[PDB]
Design a protein around this ligand. Sequence first.
Ligand SMILES: *[C@@H]1O[C@H](CO)[C@@H](O)[C@H](O)[C@H]1NC(C)=O
Ligand SMILES: [Zn+2]
Length: 412
Amino acid sequence: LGRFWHISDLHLDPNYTVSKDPLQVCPSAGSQPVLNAGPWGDYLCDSPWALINSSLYAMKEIEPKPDFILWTGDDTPHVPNESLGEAAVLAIVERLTNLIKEVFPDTKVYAALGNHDFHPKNQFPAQSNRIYNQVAELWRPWLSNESYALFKRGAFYSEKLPGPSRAGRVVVLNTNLYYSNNEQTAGMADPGEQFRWLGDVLSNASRDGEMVYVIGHVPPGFFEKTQNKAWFRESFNEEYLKVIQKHHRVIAGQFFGHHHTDSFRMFYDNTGAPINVMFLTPGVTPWKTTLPGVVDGANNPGIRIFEYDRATLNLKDLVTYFLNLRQANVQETPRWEQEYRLTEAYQVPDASVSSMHTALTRIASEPHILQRYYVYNSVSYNHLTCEDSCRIEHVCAIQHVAFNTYATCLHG
Ligand SMILES: *[C@@H]1O[C@H](CO)[C@@H](O)[C@H](O)[C@H]1NC(C)=O
Ligand SMILES: [Zn+2]
């Protein structure tokens, strides 16, 4: 039984300070007063360095020897571009990289850039640039030579699983190329030829008898905390769905972030059969989001471990851990606790496609399972009841990655 960590959306705020001025605690809160900020963070702020360091050492305490770590980006704070140049972005990425290397010196990391890991934010080019080159240098110890060249060109690559094993491969995507706010790829059908490349990779895996873990930052489909918010341009969404529908037999799981909230996405074929599942891991940052439509969109800091079969890559379980920031901010040393274990939370035998489909049906049909899922969705920050509209938003987001099916589900 192997284990691997998944962390995402650390969103370091370099300027977080416990200030008596509510408006000078953290630039990531904008003009929102931050009253009684604590040393481990604030729900209105991105992560202080203390919080990120705490998350890494909590991972080390819980499991110091993972098979590997998946890290899906977003290292910089939610601030105006003018406050955050390219040098600062690269320095922040390097500092988080070096922290992971120092806490887990000998552990392979599969790292994907998040939409904030660029200057200007979200403007990911479909070609090589200074940031891709420097980050390729930073992550070079985890990259094969082919992966190094590929990352320099488009920040995507495919790496063997650690050790001698030829079971399994991790495909690291740069899905920031598909975010609608990315003007660098507007008018591009297959930016960086990623989709084509991905198809080839998956084909090779089927030829070679490998299973694949696909990771990326920005997921296809919709954001469960509001209605009709998708990140991918529609054509990119459709292409990603086509890729999954063709190659689901070699994909043992998908792992993404960018929501900061805990949810999952099911993929179905045209017969209704469940064919794949994507796990949206929560963020370390607790930052209350400024996205229109979302109310009280903060979360507790979360980290996640997966238990998997090394021979087959079958996902056996996941365990999500969290820091109750309200409690941690009055304590000498913050202690992370198990938030939940998937199989226990949803009464399913594993984290496979069938099990995740069962979990979705339970969420959609049983009020206490829906409430359990909803509390975990904010990493146990928001304990209010998920009523009918909330239920529909979450069920439709989980069940429908396609635009048309999601909207029709929303009609309900
Ligand atoms: C990071 O956390 C570890 C473990 O709690 C602690 O020993 C160390 O002092 C922390 N480092 C910083 C810079 O806060
Ligand atoms: Zn993001």
